[PDB]
Amino acid sequence: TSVKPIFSRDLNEAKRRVRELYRAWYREVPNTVHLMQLDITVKQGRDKVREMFMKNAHVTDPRVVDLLVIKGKMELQETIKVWKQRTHVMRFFHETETPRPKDFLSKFYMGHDP
Amino acid sequence: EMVRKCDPHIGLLHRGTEKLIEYKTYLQALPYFDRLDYVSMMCNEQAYSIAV
Amino acid sequence: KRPTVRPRSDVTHKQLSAFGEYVAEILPKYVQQVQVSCLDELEICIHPDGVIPTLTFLRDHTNAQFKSLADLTAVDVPTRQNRFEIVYNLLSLRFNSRIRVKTYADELTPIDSIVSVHIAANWYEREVWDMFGVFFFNHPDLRRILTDYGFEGHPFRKDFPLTGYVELRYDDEVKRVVAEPVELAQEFRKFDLNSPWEAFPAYRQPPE
Amino acid sequence: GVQVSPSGEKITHTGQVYDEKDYRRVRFVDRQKEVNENFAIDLIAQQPVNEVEHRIIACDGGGGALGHPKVYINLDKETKTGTCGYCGLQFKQHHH
Amino acid sequence: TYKYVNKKEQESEVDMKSATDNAARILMWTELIRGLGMTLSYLFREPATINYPFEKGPLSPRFRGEHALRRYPSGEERCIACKLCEAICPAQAITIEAEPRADGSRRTTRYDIDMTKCIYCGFCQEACPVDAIVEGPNFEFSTETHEELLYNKEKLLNNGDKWEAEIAANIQADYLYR
Amino acid sequence: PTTNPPTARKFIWTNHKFNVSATPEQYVPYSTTRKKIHEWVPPSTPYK
Amino acid sequence: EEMLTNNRIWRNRTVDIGVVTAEDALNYGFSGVMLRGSGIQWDLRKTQPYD
Amino acid sequence: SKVKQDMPPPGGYGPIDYKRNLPRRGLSGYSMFAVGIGALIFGYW
Amino acid sequence: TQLITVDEKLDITTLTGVPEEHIKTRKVRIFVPARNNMQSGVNNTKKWKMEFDTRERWENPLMGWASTADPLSNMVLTFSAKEDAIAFAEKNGWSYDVEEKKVPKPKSKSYGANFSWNKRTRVSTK
Amino acid sequence: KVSPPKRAEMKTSMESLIHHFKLYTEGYQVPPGATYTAIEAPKGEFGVYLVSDGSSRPYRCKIKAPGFAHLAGLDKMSKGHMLADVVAIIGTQDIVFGEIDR
Amino acid sequence: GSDRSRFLEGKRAVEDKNIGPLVKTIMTRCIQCTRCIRFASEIAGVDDLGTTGRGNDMQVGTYIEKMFMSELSGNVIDICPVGALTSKPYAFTARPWETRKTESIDVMDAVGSNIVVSTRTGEVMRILPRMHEDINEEWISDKTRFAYDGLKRQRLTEPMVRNEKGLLTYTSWEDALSRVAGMLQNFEGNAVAAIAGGLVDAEALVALKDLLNKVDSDNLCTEEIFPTEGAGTDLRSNYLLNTTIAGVEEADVVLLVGTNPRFEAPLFNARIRKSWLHNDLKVALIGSPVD
Amino acid sequence: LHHAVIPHGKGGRSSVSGVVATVFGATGFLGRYVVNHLGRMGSQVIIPYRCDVYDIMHLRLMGDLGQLTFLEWDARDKDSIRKAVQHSNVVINLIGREWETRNFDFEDVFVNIPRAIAQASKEAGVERFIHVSHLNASMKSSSKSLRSKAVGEKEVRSVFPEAIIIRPSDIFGREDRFLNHFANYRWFLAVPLVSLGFKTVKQPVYVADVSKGIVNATKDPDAVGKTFAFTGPNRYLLFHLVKYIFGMTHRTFIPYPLPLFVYSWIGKLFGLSPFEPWTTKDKVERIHISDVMPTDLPGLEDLGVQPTPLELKSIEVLRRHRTYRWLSSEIEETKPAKTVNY
Amino acid sequence: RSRAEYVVTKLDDLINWARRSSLWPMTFGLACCAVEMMHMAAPRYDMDRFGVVFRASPRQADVMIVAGTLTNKMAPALRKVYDQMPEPRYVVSMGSCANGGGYYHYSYSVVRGCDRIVPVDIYVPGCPPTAEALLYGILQLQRKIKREQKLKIWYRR
Ligand SMILES: NC(=O)C1=CN([C@@H]2O[C@H](COP(=O)(O)OP(=O)(O)OC[C@H]3O[C@@H](n4cnc5c(N)ncnc54)[C@H](OP(=O)(O)O)[C@@H]3O)[C@@H](O)[C@H]2O)C=CC1
Ligand code: SF4
Ligand code: SF4
Ligand code: SF4
Ligand code: SF4
Ligand code: SF4
Ligand SMILES: [K+]
Ligand SMILES: [Zn+2]
């Protein structure tokens, strides 16, 4: 139950790196929307960034949080230098994906999947 | 037109041929190498055959 | 004599065994195992902390002179604790030799990067990180090199499916190339091409 | 031979034919359902039984290496002919 | 051994004749004129262009083209549903469903070859133990829809009946090598 | 094939067909296997 | 070679373009014709022969 | 039967040239500058 | 200074990149595969295997092929130990069912039992 | 047990047919172990690192391409140059991209 | 073995037998290993197979035209190493590398034999036994082995409701469940009752039991009758094979009352015969005398 | 049902949903989105066409292999109509023109073709028919097209009595002739609206929402025999709509009050063209008629589609008409037009 | 029949003749199949003899020939270079990778056919399809675009 750290000794500086990454993403969203001709608004993209952070927000292992921070910085750098396209950025919103309903009746009526 | 940095983004012709070769047998994975280097076909076949 | 079986020379085996003892006694701090294969190939398995000293010693030593990096590879064995085995194939042009240096890692313990030793390790470790998810410390620019932008997951891992999770198609409402969950017209038929009879008695594991 | 359904479409030699209420005949609307005119079971039915003199015959399908693997057929039953499992040729032992 | 492609052995010194030759080479474009001469020689050569579609390029009897299912001289289908063509097909472009026929013969009921997956590698025709599946040398079967390249048993049997005067002769001419 | 004619068979095509793409006699794929699961047919007589 | 090798246009396009040293090629992991162009005497067919 | 196999002739194949062959054409420099200067002077006159 | 402590279960589900439904709604089996009774060879009963639950496999309209919607259908993983398979499954966040290894029971075999004077194991044919 | 027999031997002999069947369905079993084979391709040193677990399918196949390292070295080669010099460098590294991307 | 043959002679051929439409015999492939003979002599207990002849002409099978059917008769198809004794329903259908293996449990009887279902492209193709030393060893009954083809006929695929004419017509899940739910909320406790058959799992049983208990119904009956007097289903030892199959192996006298175990539970009777052969089990029967 | 029409899969490209739909106006503007939704959810779509194979060829990627059957048809060929509707359980009618040709006019296109299609569908016994009319096409309107669409509604309801009639508002999209038309008024000097664009209320509806509503009407058991009103969330006056359109275009705004009779005269002048006309008379009074308030008719909420607003779906269709100078402008750079309750 | 429709048929024949005699491809190719494409360009088969001239930019192109495997990284770029061509544009899919995924059909980073991204007019099968079969596919495309009746459909409108 004792491991070698990656960057953060404990959870607090990992949260500090998370906060810095969120700061960079929040600053980058308006520039991304202005540069690449996105149909979305700036506030919608900030909602997207916030909810991605929220789905990742349940983890408490410092090494895993450091690796998620590193992947987020890679993703951010691919957003800074324009290597993603409009399609690559817009894949986050799942607007062409019909969402699977979570109700048991709907899952029963569609098919055999649980 | 003076160049200061070159960053070749690759993987635009990437197909996961190593994973496919892993999922197939040796004779089945033999023709993957011609399409690895489609200019050096029999050289690739020679390399794979010598390894096997 | 025998036209079917490959000829075997013992002088290469003895030379590689002597060099294995040489390297093992020079570096007892990191070297965990030294073996010579029947195919006359020398492998040294080291601690992950010893990547920098082992690679620097093999590159810069007078008797080693392994100045050329042949390749840098990861092998995913998902039954051991450190599942990613990192393999460094090196070539010595002075002594006309090839050496293999092995080490281990898992998803949460990165290993040191050898861009300061060999420059091909830059792109090789970028590929290894992109395909297996092994982080590299003190790398100049570690990022994806072969997968698509925004690709989730490392596809050369064992647990990653062959067909993947996501697939692309052109959508006409949005006039874009969109990504949707994978769905195949014909599923890849897996085959059980594993004979139930033991082929090689030399590699028989004792029963548990 | 090739037979037609009540729907009007021709039946394949394996017995496959689309129903009256299938939605999958729209793929044959303004096109044609391609079927094999020569039926293998009929063509092997027209071939006469080879009357041989030995108790065990050997078949390779003709042409030597251009045929099938060489298989041996035991012609002991006089109430039925021995059939090659590869080519379908029938053999009968001549007891006269 | 090895040889030098750009290193010169010693030096040719400086001579008035050599200097004047170098001056003529610089000023009068001598290598450009000899390149023009080689280019004009290729102009006055005879072209190597065949007259498609009225002329066709040479091939070998080993050629791998459109797939086909052959028959015996009796007319029985050669295939016996052993699925070696699937088990060796690297792209998994072959699907076989089989059942006993009305006379008990072992015959396929479904034999699909997805030619948009096929890599035209001849593994099926070299793994077939009865020479049923073959790659006939037809290559001019380009279609206008994706569906028309999804072959089934009836299409492959039609190909085998169409190209039988071709495929049997090619196997007769080539079979002693394999 | 005038001094060396090919072998004549009864199943060979007596008339050659060229490529018939974008033409009414083009090839259309279909599943050549019959139905697998046969459903239960309800009876035509009411219980009451 | 008559078309290209002695051509001054080709020589202006190719000479002193993309020069790489032997130590840099060895450290960067170059192989084949590039090491030979840099001057490193190395060939797999002559050093570790096969077939 | 004797084995028939794809074999070279027993005398071997003929010699195949592989060295580079520059024809070494053209004239000397002195004569061609002489022709040039003669053209210059004749045109001027 | 270079060695910290954590009291958790080593969850990497956010790092593997698998979508959420294929983590939460999936079940895996850890088992020694049973020997194929059409053969007597038992070399396939040596390594533990983890497989996934079977999802829907339907029929294609155009050709009748087996169309599927799950990605983890052909996924089988090989393990040297049951506890190693447990560690991998708990690390990847999949709920697991484990079947114990069915070793064949040792049996008393004697050729003289075929020819007993009084006992019932005497065989009437050879 | 490795290379398939002749077709006449297949059709006239039992064990030749058995070996043909098993080779063209399952394939030959490679004994477990790892190797690295380097062959002088015209573009450079084409290497393959093959790891076999004892089955008829390879456990791992890493494809070392010379062009991958050459394109990694493209950045140093193009210092102090222009667009035409860059396309000349791309040409003279003898780059194909199937072996690079894999 | 070797990789090339020195046999330059002609091979023998043996005429095929007709022992039944289950076990298809191509007896040229037989290598005379007597496994089927020993199985029929000891486990099947029929003594209907044997070797007729001498030397190279020795043939396995029945001398007369005899239809070989007892229970447990697909295990000769299992234990025949060559393809001489194959399965006629499985004939020419699929290949073992195609067939995906699923470890399941038999429901054809109450022994609970561990089985493998072999499925190809989303369709059940074969049933094989599994090695469980405490239940069924290496064998399954013929009904278990060859009853898989009944899952492709007379199968309910869509929900049906009675029409106003009185006929069953296809409908939607919403409509069918709405009708049944309306009748369920209409009717009270004792007016609602349920009867369970034989091929039902415990999940559905507890599901329907909970539903009927929520609608206050306790008439949760099964088709099979067990005496409810005394303890009944209260004590679990009252309705169980308490000695179990290892206890069949261990016991020395067995008294069978009112049962025909050969057809009611073929693997149970097979283990009784195994104990009778090896441990000299003393077997007695009260009931009609059956073989 | 039938065994081949039972739905399967997770609703992707390769799934089967059991919708066999003959879409008659699939080569138009709404038809491409309809066939996209059907192919995306997985359906056997029959596209009868009269234009060129290249003209329908953009539809060819919009489904899986073999899920789209293209068939030539003629509006005067009942044989072609019944061979198109022969194998279907849904028949969708999107046939319509915004002008009159020498072969087909408003009454033919909006009455005779839908009546023939509905008659062939009834003879073939298809389960479901969906017919797209227009909103506020009640009767005795100022335009010939809406009276023709009303007569077509009555004919379709007479022939196939349980037809799902969908009446959408002025549908806006990428290839529409509403927003692109208003933005292409910028090529002239001014925007000549009738009464300066006031007292004319319009509530446009997005083409993706219309197509989703059509698909949900194919798969909705409660939609049989009903008339739906596909309307947007916000009502705008015509003047404010044109002002917002030109604000997103960032071109200019010069409105002009020009009377209806002479504006219809110049609309007829533009419509007298052998090609596709820029505007017609029927176009200009269909623009200048107001859209009625949907009170009793069910809508997109009842069919399960939440109507996307024009303010959210406006920049994907007007960014073409901007110049370079205002190309990289976001949503919030333009003031949205004020909505009216009436 | 009437005189005007004969005239519009003759104008259809003229326009289709021009469009099939002048067929300029975009300089696009990805793989093995692109090597076979430039082997059609080689002097033996002579697309220049057939009237077919490479132009690098899609604006000067008529036909887009998908020669190679379409990866997930390549698909948006392919859709881009297809959309930026002018309207009289055609698509020739080349080889098994471009038709139906081919030898990488079960790959994570390969789309299963270029028809999932761009509308394909003619599929040329093979791996690689020879330059013979490629010249065949080009001639088939010429026949296809001769078969179009644009002005006749416009007149019958
Ligand atoms: N456009 C809008 O904003 C609104 C439209 N609608 C209605 O919705 C429907 C679809 O809209 P939309 O896409 O804009 O319409 P279109 O103008 O684009 O035409 C729709 C389809 O009708 C076909 N068509 C037209 N006339 C004929 C004819 N005589 N014979 C055969 N086919 C014919 C066209 O085929 P082809 O190209 O081959 O001629 C086209 O595929 C129409 O009925 C329209 O009135 C309702 C509300 C708003
Ligand atoms: S290998 Fe030949 S005989 Fe065997 S299934 Fe395939 S085509 Fe038929
Ligand atoms: S040629 Fe190769 S890829 Fe094609 S069907 Fe035969 S075995 Fe499969
Ligand atoms: S089990 Fe099979 S091989 Fe053995 S004797 Fe019986 S039939 Fe012959
Ligand atoms: S597969 Fe086995 S039993 Fe069948 S013929 Fe071959 S060797 Fe004999
Ligand atoms: S179809 Fe074959 S030749 Fe063409 S790109 Fe794919 S692998 Fe290469
Ligand atoms: K058997
Ligand atoms: Zn035969």
Swiss-Prot record, chain A:
Alphabetic keyword roster: Electron transport, Membrane, Mitochondrion, Mitochondrion inner membrane, Respiratory chain, Transport
GO CC field: mitochondrial inner membrane; mitochondrion; respiratory chain complex I
InterPro entries (UniProt xref): Complex1_LYR_NDUFA6_LYRM6, NADH_Ub_cplx-1_asu_su-6
Membrane-topology annotation of the record: Peripheral membrane protein
UniProt GO BP: aerobic respiration; mitochondrial respiratory chain complex I assembly; proton motive force-driven mitochondrial ATP synthesis
UniProt keyword Transmembrane helix, yes or no: no
Subcellular location(s) of the protein: Mitochondrion inner membrane
Alphabetical list of Pfam families matching this protein: Complex1_LYR_2 (PF13233)
Keyword Glycosyltransferase attributed: no
PANTHER family: NADH DEHYDROGENASE [UBIQUINONE] 1 ALPHA SUBCOMPLEX SUBUNIT 6, NADH-UBIQUINONE OXIDOREDUCTASE B14 SUBUNIT
Stated family: Belongs to the complex I LYR family.
Subunit structure and binding partners: Mammalian complex I is composed of 45 different subunits.
Function: Accessory subunit of the mitochondrial membrane respiratory chain NADH dehydrogenase (Complex I), that is believed to be not involved in catalysis. Required for proper complex I assembly. Complex I functions in the transfer of electrons from NADH to the respiratory chain. The immediate electron acceptor for the enzyme is believed to be ubiquinone.
Name of the protein in question: NADH dehydrogenase [ubiquinone] 1 alpha subcomplex subunit 6
Species name: Mus musculus
Curated annotation (Swiss-Prot), chain I:
Subcellular localization(s) per the UniProt record: Mitochondrion inner membrane
Main subcellular location of this protein, as a coarse class: mitochondrion
Membrane topology note: Peripheral membrane protein
GO terms for MF: NADH dehydrogenase (ubiquinone) activity
CC terms in the record's Gene Ontology section: mitochondrial inner membrane; mitochondrion; respiratory chain complex I
Family: Belongs to the complex I NDUFS4 subunit family.
Protein's job: Accessory subunit of the mitochondrial membrane respiratory chain NADH dehydrogenase (Complex I), that is believed not to be involved in catalysis. Complex I functions in the transfer of electrons from NADH to the respiratory chain. The immediate electron acceptor for the enzyme is believed to be ubiquinone.
Protein name per the record: NADH dehydrogenase [ubiquinone] iron-sulfur protein 4, mitochondrial
Species, as recorded: Mus musculus (Mouse)
Curated annotation (Swiss-Prot), chain L:
One Pfam family of this chain: NmrA
Posttranslational mods: Acetylated on lysine residues. BLOC1S1 is required for acetylation. Acetylated by CLOCK in a circadian manner.
InterPro entries: ComplexI_NDUFA9_subunit, NAD(P)-bd_dom_sf, NmrA-like
Predominant cellular place of this UniProt entry's protein: mitochondrion
Cofactor requirement: FAD
Record GO biological process: aerobic respiration; circadian rhythm; proton motive force-driven mitochondrial ATP synthesis
The record's free-text note on cofactor binding: Binds 1 FAD per subunit.
Residue positions where N6-acetyllysine is found in the record: 154, 335
GO molecular function: NADH dehydrogenase activity; protein-containing complex binding
Alphabetical list of SUPFAM superfamilies matching this protein: NAD(P)-binding Rossmann-fold domains
The keyword Ribonucleoprotein is annotated on this UniProt entry: no
Cellular component GO terms, alphabetical: mitochondrial inner membrane; mitochondrial matrix; mitochondrion; respiratory chain complex I
Locations listed in the record: Mitochondrion matrix
Keyword annotations of the record: Acetylation, Electron transport, FAD, Flavoprotein, Mitochondrion, Respiratory chain, Transit peptide, Transport
Annotated CDD domains: NDUFA9_like_SDR_a
Keyword Flavoprotein: yes
Coiled-coil features, chain-numbered ranges: none
N6-succinyllysine: modified positions: 140
Role summary: Accessory subunit of the mitochondrial membrane respiratory chain NADH dehydrogenase (Complex I), that is believed not to be involved in catalysis. Complex I functions in the transfer of electrons from NADH to the respiratory chain. The immediate electron acceptor for the enzyme is believed to be ubiquinone.
PANTHER family in the cross-refs: NADH DEHYDROGENASE [UBIQUINONE] 1 ALPHA SUBCOMPLEX SUBUNIT 9, MITOCHONDRIAL (PTHR12126:SF11), NADH-UBIQUINONE OXIDOREDUCTASE 39 KDA SUBUNIT-RELATED (PTHR12126)
Family listed: Belongs to the complex I NDUFA9 subunit family.
Taxonomic source organism: Mus musculus
Lineage: Eukaryota, Metazoa, Chordata, Craniata, Vertebrata
Swiss-Prot record, chain M:
Catalytic activity, EC: 7.1.1.2
Keywords attached to this entry: 4Fe-4S, Electron transport, Iron, Iron-sulfur, Membrane, Metal-binding, Mitochondrion, Mitochondrion inner membrane, NAD, Oxidoreductase, Phosphoprotein, Respiratory chain, Transit peptide, Translocase, Transport, Ubiquinone
Post-translational modification: Hydroxylated ar Arg-44 by NDUFAF5 early in the pathway of assembly of complex I, before the formation of the juncture between peripheral and membrane arms.
Any one of the GO BP annotations: proton motive force-driven mitochondrial ATP synthesis
Location(s) in or outside the cell: Mitochondrion inner membrane
Span within the parent record: 68 to 224 of 224
Biological role stated in the UniProt entry: Core subunit of the mitochondrial membrane respiratory chain NADH dehydrogenase (Complex I) which catalyzes electron transfer from NADH through the respiratory chain, using ubiquinone as an electron acceptor. Essential for the catalytic activity of complex I.
Cofactor note as given: Binds 1 [4Fe-4S] cluster.
Catalyses which reaction(s): a ubiquinone + NADH + 5 H(+)(in) = a ubiquinol + NAD(+) + 4 H(+)(out)
Primary location: mitochondrion
Protein name: NADH dehydrogenase [ubiquinone] iron-sulfur protein 7, mitochondrial
One GO term describing the cellular component: mitochondrion
Transmembrane segments: none
Cofactor(s) annotated in UniProt: [4Fe-4S] cluster
Residue positions binding [4Fe-4S] cluster: 32-33, 97, 127
This protein's record includes keyword Cytoplasm: no
One MF term in the entry's GO annotations: quinone binding
